[PDB]
Symmetry: C3
Subunit: 214 residues, 3 copies
Amino acid sequence: DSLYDISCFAAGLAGNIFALALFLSPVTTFKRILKAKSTERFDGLPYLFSLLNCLICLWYGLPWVADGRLLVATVNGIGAVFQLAYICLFIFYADSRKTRMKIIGLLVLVVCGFALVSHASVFFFDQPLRQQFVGAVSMASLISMFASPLAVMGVVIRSESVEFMPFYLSLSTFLMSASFALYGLLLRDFFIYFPNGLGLILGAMQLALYAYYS
Amino acid sequence: DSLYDISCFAAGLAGNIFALALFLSPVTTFKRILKAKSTERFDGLPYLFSLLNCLICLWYGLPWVADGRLLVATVNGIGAVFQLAYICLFIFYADSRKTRMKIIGLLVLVVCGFALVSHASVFFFDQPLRQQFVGAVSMASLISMFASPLAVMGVVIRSESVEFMPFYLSLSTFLMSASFALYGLLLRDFFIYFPNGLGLILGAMQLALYAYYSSNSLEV
Amino acid sequence: SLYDISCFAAGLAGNIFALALFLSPVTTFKRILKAKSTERFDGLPYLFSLLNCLICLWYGLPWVADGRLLVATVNGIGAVFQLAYICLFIFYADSRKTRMKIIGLLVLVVCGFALVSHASVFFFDQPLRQQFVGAVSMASLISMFASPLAVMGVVIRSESVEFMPFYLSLSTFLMSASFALYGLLLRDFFIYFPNGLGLILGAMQLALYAYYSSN
Ligand SMILES: CCCCCCCCCO[C@@H]1O[C@H](CO)[C@@H](O)[C@H](O)[C@H]1O
């Protein structure tokens, strides 16, 4: 009765915290940027990607696009802020006109691209199609993000070292995916569960792979 | 059929008029191939890609696939002819057996691919799904086209030159996108509007850079 | 009556021709067998082929889609091969890392498949379930066409037919021609379109070989 509603609240809230560590992770890399006050070692795009991904999922969270999936709006809303901050700092601490011009442009594309689809979903669609369209787009967007953790695992093995795959980040993320998969499961929302379920698996292999290497 | 009915025609036509410049654009690049009679310098794939895009959108244009959206059929039908001509000139002038043959297989592939999907849809589907299916396929095709303008935008930034991004082409495409995005908006057609909307943003994005690099050029 | 048996014929033809495609990597594998090492080889396709065979297997089962039993049979056969091929690949390998990169991917495939296989039955009810799985399988199937196409490109560059056997392509082509036919009668887009897409490639494969055989 009252319990189920608190439980949905619990699963989402668990994720919103666990997500924070992941959001936090660029800062350690970012300090190295703050060092030498140059961006030479890394570009620099993923933040642009993460922001776009957060924006679309944020849209999904809003009550008109999907209802009772509001906790999801909060986490990406937090995340969109995180990615937005990283980029703004990235722009300031940039090496050359060329990086600065490139990142600014992509930010324009991301903001405009998101604006166009976010408007289009509400303008051109009436529920229940609007949810599945945003839900489909948001989900596809999320799975694409799995490319980076998959890549990091690939790096870890060949290198034979876990230096770049921190245990703290990997665990919090596994659990984050886990909370959300349950949350998706409770509303019987395919769009929340399936991508988050896939992330969990990736998180699971990451921990297991980590342990052997330790 | 009323007042708004004139407007849609206008937008479709306007888009239809702006589209040719994009269609014509390879010819200036193309003219060099013909002299010295070789393609060694240029491959050569995009014309094949553009054609496949034009057929699918063309098919969407047709009345059985979609109703009241023939202008789309016209613009792509026009484009497909340009692309087919571009391909054929490219075929004869292809340098080496491998270039000429590879294109033939791809060209064989494109027409076969299109015939199969165009048949499958009319055969396997009853409206409104057919419209939705083709529009979905048509739209996905159109966004892929966007890969090329994004890259040239990338080169301009690296080059710090507007040499490869002519203003005439940028404006024309921007207008084609605006016209077609507007056209889609009027009919409440997501399939036409959205990529064109996406294309408009790219077009706008291109105009902004040219203004910056042309203004910040050495000559000024 | 007459047609029902006809369904069995087209599916059977495909189920038989599949073994030839499934068998074809064995010849490259024998080379793996001598010296028990994979230095030349990184075998992503066996991991790729298994996952595709798995998903279509799901589409084949009666609760997922009904009367789609032959497709269930053929990939179920196929998945084991890929399952078998992966196993020989793991024990005989160059370094722990070649083995280890692959081990994880196999975990992903089984977990990935289980997750999607379960998710479908849990979150979806007919007629959507058939539509969802058929789509995932279909998209998966069309992706497989990438390898034969590249080989076509190779034939052109090489000016040689060494990298694609003539016997292999027709057997593949006949399966593609037969299975596309299997899909059409039940009016199943999901079976027909990709398989129809495959035969076309198959036709291209045969024609190129014929060209090179002549001159
Ligand atoms: C020789 C290079 C072989 C692939 C390189 C491995 C690391 C690349 C990250 O993986 C990516 O995962 C995504 C979904 O998980 C996919 O969008 C994408 O297709 C895939 O590339």
